[model samples]
Target: XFTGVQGRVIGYDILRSPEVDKAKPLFTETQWDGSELPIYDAKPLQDALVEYFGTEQDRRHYPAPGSFIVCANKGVTAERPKNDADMKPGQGYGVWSAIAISFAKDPTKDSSMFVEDAGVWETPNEDELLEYLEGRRKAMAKSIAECGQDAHASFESSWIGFAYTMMEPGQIGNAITVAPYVSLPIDSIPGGSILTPDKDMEIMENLTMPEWLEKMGYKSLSANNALKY
Candidate 1:
């Protein structure tokens, strides 16, 4: 009888989320439900996230990243039902981007404290993603260059973005892990408060925001066989 037991363990190296693609209307404050706390940062449970999204095939159509791309909060996510709508498919899946902040004053609770603003992001080609990245980077580079003269560190402007690749289709079946470990960032916080300016631990930590923008690579939505998958 003791031979069979049920348990849970957070997944490792979670990259992107299913919502990355279907986040369109939400951004403009068109569609959304009010932001609510998460039962747990179970987002690390890739299986759970996928189920909330679509199928492994859908993820393959996209991709989940193994790490996070850190950015500042002047922009990010946590839903605002008062402002947007959750009217789209997959609930929170297929949205492209978001800036997030947890609502809870405490970081230890399982509740999804911080939230990010998500959107539907599709460029029709990798070049587009690259072009967009470069644009974002250019502005950041200039800002960082200027900030270099100061002793205090100031990260990139909020609108800066990041991406993650996903697992192959068949490889994932009814899994329940959320793409990113919601708690990972919070757990890694160096300060006692969730939003303290002294917060340490970055999605792409150790790298400057401009460096992250300039150095990070993205898979093109327009890659072909001859170019190599």
Candidate 2:
């Protein structure tokens, strides 16, 4: 099967209604193209879905994307974790969550399920892990600075803490406005291999078998926005 297709919906406006605008006397589950701006679709390429995942591989059939959530998703295999914290679940702190989540505007894409398949991140404390993160962010910055202003997305040390966003934010923000869907990696995360972060998801509690420590997001969130010099 061919690899690296556009997947589903891409980036969204970081600062806008239907986006940030959805207010409520109550809460509503976010949906696609619903009172939103600048929505992009996986048209044209959608027709090729079968060619990539297979005709029988329907998105709706899969219940959940599986624990391979926060781990790497390249053409390699990931070592399975042994516990809950190691689950690498999605939907949480901004750092570990997708910058923008894509939904099917029409019923099919929505009712249909698609796990973006998280990318593998570096483990904590390990010097190589830290270096990999530093390199990723730096490379992202460098690419934008040299390549021209455009929307960008990559994994690592973000505000909330661990994991990378599923997609990047598109044109819109306070001082920064990373565009929407700059481009998809022709073969980034080449295969479906992934990993988790934070001093490693492994730990043997000091006091008891039940007690444990979770991986902290980054060195610091307060200064997170400040450009690294």
Clashes of each: 60, 23
Candidate 2, residue 77: the lDDT equals: 21
Judged by whole-model lDDT over C-alpha atoms, candidate 2 comes out at 0.23
* Cα lDDT tens digits for candidate 2, 1-229: 1112333221111101121223221112212222322222222122221122223323211213342223222221233233323424432111221111223234322221222222343242335544554444433333322221121221111111113322122211111111122222222212212342221212211211111111211121112232220
Candidate 2 runs further than 4 Å off = 1-128, 149-229
True-structure lDDT of candidate 1: 0.28
Report how far residue 184 has shifted in candidate 2, in Å: 27
CA lDDT, every prediction?
A: 0.28, 0.23
Query: Residue by residue across 1-229, what tens digits does model 1's lDDT show?
Result: 0000121112111232322222232121111122221222222223322322334443321223564633223222222122333433322211233222222222232222222322332323555555554454344433432332232222211122333222222221121112232333333222335665333333423432223223334232222211111
